[PDB]
Amino acid sequence: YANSTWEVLQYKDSGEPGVLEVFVTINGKVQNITFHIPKTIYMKFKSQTMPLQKIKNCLIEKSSASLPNTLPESVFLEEKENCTSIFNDENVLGVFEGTITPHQRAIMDLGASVTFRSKAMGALGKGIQQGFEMKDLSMAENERYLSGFSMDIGYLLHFPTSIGYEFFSLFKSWGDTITINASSLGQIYKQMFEKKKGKIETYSYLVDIKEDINFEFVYFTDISKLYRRLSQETTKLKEERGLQFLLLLQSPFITKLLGTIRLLNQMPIVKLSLQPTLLKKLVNHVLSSGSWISHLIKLSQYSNIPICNLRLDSMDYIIDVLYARKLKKENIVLWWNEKAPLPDHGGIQNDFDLNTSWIMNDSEFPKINNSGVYDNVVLDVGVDNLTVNTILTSALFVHDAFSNDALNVLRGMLKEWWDEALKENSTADLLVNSLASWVQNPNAKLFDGLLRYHVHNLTKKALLQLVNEFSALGSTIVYADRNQILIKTNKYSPENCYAYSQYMMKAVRTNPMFSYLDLNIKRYWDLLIWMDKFNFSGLACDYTAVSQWQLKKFLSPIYQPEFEDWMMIILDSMLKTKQSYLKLNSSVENSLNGFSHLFSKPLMKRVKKLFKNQQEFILDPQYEADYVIPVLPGSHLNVKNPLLELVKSLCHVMLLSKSTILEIRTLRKELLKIFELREFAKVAEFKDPSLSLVVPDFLCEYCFFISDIDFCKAAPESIFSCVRCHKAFNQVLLQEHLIQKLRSDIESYLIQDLRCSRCHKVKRDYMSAHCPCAGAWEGTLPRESIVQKLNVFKQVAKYYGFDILLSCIADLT
Template identity: 25%
Template sequence: MDAPVATIFKGARMTTTYVWEIVQIRPRRDPGKFTLWLSLEDRLVSVPLRIPREFYLNLKSPDTSLFDSSYDAESLVRTLPRNHPCRHLFRVTVPESEFLEMESHFAHLTNNPNVDGVYEMQIPHTMRAVLRLGTACTTTKENDISITRTQSIGLELNGLERAGPSLTKRAYLDGGRILKTLFLYHAINHGRHVLVLVLPSGKFQVHLASPAGSREPLRKMQEQYSALNSARKAAGIVSLYEYPEEIEAHFSYHKDEHKLMAALSAELGTLTDKNYSIVLSSSRDPEYFDLRVKNMYKFPVIPMLTDRAAHLVAVPLQWQSETVEKLMTQYLFFGSWLRVAVEQSTYFDVPVGNIGADAPLFFADIDFARRLWQNDSLLWWSPGLRPDLGGMEHDANAPSEDPNSSVDLANPGCYTNVCLAINVRNLALNSVLQSGIVNELEGTAGATAFDSTSHTLNDYTSGEARASATLGDSVLSPQTFGILKGMAKTWLLDKVRNPGGPSEHAVDHFWRWLSSPSAQMYDPSLQRFVQGLMKKTFIQMLAEFKRLGSQVVKADFGHIILVTSKPPGTASAYATYLLNAVNSHELFTHLELQPDRYYDFLLFMDSANLGGVVSEDPYSTSSNSGPCIAMSWNIESFFPPAVRTAFHQDLRRIIVELYTEHQTHADADRAPLRVIDNLTQDSSAVPQDEVQQKTNEAVTKYLETRLTRRLLGRVSKILASQKQAFTEEEMPAEWLCPLLPGSHRTMATPVIEYVKAMCACLTLIRTHSNEVGILRRNLLELVGVREFASEAQWSDPSARCRVPHVVCRTCTHVRDLDLCRDADLMERTSARSRPGATETKWNCPACNSAYDRRAIESTLIDNIRSLIAAHQAQDLKCTRCKQIRVDDMSPHCKCAGAWQLTVGRAEALRRIRVLTNVATFHGLPFLKEYAESTLARW
């Protein structure tokens, strides 16, 4: 055991051989200067850190005269983003202060005609330090300096190096147990501030500021705390923070935000020498408090990343109780959150105080960037929507969404066998890891695969070796894809070794990271390449389901509905066999296929219009409580209220009666189970063809008699009520058709729309098209419409506004949103930020977490840009022979036909008008403004 050492000598012992654990790298107000917060045993030490500006110039020809002698310019060779040719690459390293002083010099340097590209200019200084140092560092051999001296003169980033595993003797921050934390909670709404500083002793210092100057305290804090703390203990949640049994609240009232922040600063000033870290729970970033709280810089600040709604003061009548509940929920959650944050920081080697706002994307960015650096590749790190490609990203418009890049299959019909709904997860990860098998099965290894054949330098010089692979308009280098594949494989192996650990979180968010423009390492080309692999894998999986005896009813990347050949009662066992058989295939090893629900009977039009009998107990062959009916018909929402209820009830009854007819004959003709001799046919068994014939006869009789009489009576009643309503001076509200975001055509009278929609649903019964046709003719005749008149033709009253591959930030559930037709997206709730107002609720169906509305709105705005670009750059076709024009100069086609647009201007305007309706209905102000301005100038 070491002998006691005087405190004055402790700093001298901590030299280069000592590992410094990094809590946070924090920017200061001076450019290029940062604070490096280190954990040394039980102490927190702040060290000044200087980080230089570093970027790369790819020159067309070597010309060192471009550079000034006051900074370093080193020639080297690296792999450029998207495998762009590396000609004469120089790394420029210059202090940030000098970079700002010589702004004109560097502006001329980066815009010089000899410069082909400027790379890594957009990487923040803090992130560059995090990428290099990780969670622990030591000084280099050339910079032998004690910790005491570093506090006075500071450190250069180049004088530090990442501490290797051999130097790290314990877990990062001892698993977080050595952290002494203060909890700071901040909520705001319409000028009302609630700021709470919580000490480890349980003392709550509550600061309140209100524009009206009210002095209302937060009530029942102890009761709320005790109830939530008891629930936390009962749940057995592991926490790094020891919560007291009792709390003590002190209130301070302030007139405005400035005085509130000044009071907080004064309170923090009394705690500066006690080695505290601050865990900040706020919708505002730490920079917001750095500018307003003078003593905030004296503490490392760990942002607690949670939903914005947790930091929103409620409406005036309920603000006290709801604010107390949010405060206590966040306070009791932060201990377990900190434990998980330290685990993630340890795994991804990132200081706990530097975790990004979207942790899963941030960790993936860091891991991928480090792997690229280790393989001598430059980064395309960019905070914007486009990757940093050295300037080439601005030379072309962003590619439009390829409608063939995803899969959206639908086979309308009436399905009487059991249908199985399946949720699909990890499709992107599986497609990347099994990319070689996908291409082997399709015979495309030479075009889109990265083969493992080795090449000589002569092969690369002569161009015989491929430098990149292409899939559609995406270009990807083998090295980049290999790094991505290796990272995914590492995550998956670590997930298997440590279930529930940080790697599992990374695996779950893999596709969200690849497809999210908010990721710093987002590359549309990489996303489209992986999406192409996903499509290939998905099609192969559907083919495997078909080979095993099931047919596809509906399929997209996140959800599949299959119709089986099995009757009720055997669905669960068959589903287990089916999914195990698919997962046993080498191509689908890493896919997660989870049964969602079973339908004993399904009437399917499309993903927004379906109804059926859901099997509550898949193991049971009969239901004692009657069938459980699931109804989701978007078309009925366009009916006036007077007709909507009738349509819903009638269609529901039809589904129940059709299901009953099929089940009655299937049960009656099913022979009882008994032991029979081998090779002897059971004479009592009814042939399947005979059973089907009896069922068809029963359904035919039902359609021709009972259903025809009932629908004729229903239409007569609606027609009489409609005539009476039309005689009123003002049309009753229950007979007015609603205006919905998908409304795009003029609706006929309610009774005619009822007849057309009901007959469209019955047409799904393909085996009885003649009977349905006769019924349709009789109903149209009753309302005075000819069978083949244009007014009698049915079309979907709703347009579509599809946002594909929306990933939940909480559970990573993948879903295609239709903002015009999905019923759960139309539900309205009170807007918390605007008292008295309402807004639509966009929640994940799997975990009920809110979707990122801002990201979806940004996607829709990009869709308008892509639509305009595609319309302007589209091909021309002949009005007579429909051939596409192959040159740019011919005034007319060879057949003497005139040229016209492939997609007319009217169609583009219609789609933009739909987006305008969507923006108005769902409350998307930026989308509405952009769509309306586009319509105005077009």
């Protein structure tokens, strides 16, 4: 208890609001103590004085700032009256606006993990009997060495599965009895685990493992051995070291503990919460167990948090705890609401608000995309830490604006994180990454939609500033998507790019608002044909070539190879034209002005031959397997002539060049003359055969990468896994977020505003046949738009077999 950190603050409420477990590492040995904590409420006495004084004096006005849209009401037992003292008399319990923070949370926010009971021996003895009240005891102390030195463990990893193998395994520091030809493979991994244990002893220095790993092969067939055998084993382990160990529980679901095991392991708990090939998983997990123990030690040494922080995104918990500490240093109310993803905005958070609902589903990030052919050398520079740099440089009435005081608090917090990351601090940079990945997390214990909307808008404006800076630098932008930028440098020569690129990136780095922004060139494009993210091609470093054409999937299998082959032919045509133009010399008019002529005669000759071939085999069977239009998620266009679709696609890709527009139009007209179709005919006009269905603000649960996952245009390989890494994604998460966007669109359509059909004045009343100017009322979101969205969702669900999405579609009608 004396300068002793509790490893676990597990809720030993026992029905008492303030009684809880404190397993403080006392000087001799860890000791379990009870506490007593009043529940402070932030109900500021806004221009109204209540002399009621039910149980505890309430601070007037709380000396704090409320939430626009040192402990008042320090009551001990809120359960005295659930109605409390509701008056609604000028903000006296009229709007709660306090703290729902129960025990185990108010303590962490107020009392540091390491604490010393500064009382005499008699007072300490008195407090031992009933507990340590936070009002007069448990003052925070410094966390120079918050963790311990050498403590026993209770490693009980478990990896259940439905195949038929049970992984109810238990590990002891000295027993080494792992109760589940496993020894041979265990030694196979031990071959490198000697080096791993050397790393542990030179870096962790916490625990050591016996080398005589004996494997007990017992079939946990039924609960007699699944739980009861495990229950007796765990109580034997508990009595072996009486309250002298830390349980290391690994289980995808924790209920097994809470039934009977949790109280059988009242010693401090850490919940990791993570056939012959599957046997290797057990040995890898047991032999990697001594690696993250020192990581947790470092985390609890730096962050003033106990060892009870739940391991599933524990860094989010660290963010919430640290921000709560910093906000308690300030005199500002909180919006914790641990129970619900909503913030604790009093009682007003449970009713519908137009602005709040709109800022919930406001994730449309502007994209800059320019379709064309650019003989100039264009650089693909990938940005990173854009959100971090944005929140750092944000320093450089409005009901939609977040609390600027909390904004400054977050800015200082991020500043200290950043300049700790500059020096040796892995916790700091992990924390800044987690804050980047954390603002948009509803599960956050301090999440606020207004804060997320503010951060999104700030990132938008920072990207706009970066685009303006690059434009002023002398490199036009053809792509910008918050994750990468394509800059069209005017330097024609591929050789004269490296020095120019270095000068450009130095000039960008000189900008104060982008000093923390980091960038790196991904690829150099002497030649590039660009439409969108998923439909492009060209030469990258000048020697490599890439071709990512999703529209090729929309063509018949007979004509897809023809599409690809003629695409490389035309690419070589523009490459030769650019080379000749540069050789002669060394947009209104660029290096490409007659590249079509390199293939004009071959192109239309091959088109005529393919037209005759198709006309011969359009109706004759056994060729329809070739003249078949493949079905894609974005399929919304009916193709009567696969050859016509092919030629329209080629015409659209070769129309990208602005300088050769006339010659490309002439070639298209000549090609259409083969079909005897007019040049400007509507059927002759090409349109995108693929729709789009993006999932905004998709986050990779491993590398914390923010992306927007398309499905009607993005390839299936690009949707089930991340980009920067190659880790996969959860099907359940994909379906959840797709249904989330679907229901959000449905609600937005149902909550839209009306406006006039003639002067476009927004409808502002409720009873009106039309606008006073005789203009019919109309919604901003058309019903046809929602119909198309529902059709796209149904097509995606059917194509990818999304069961829950199909269930949602069935629920709709």
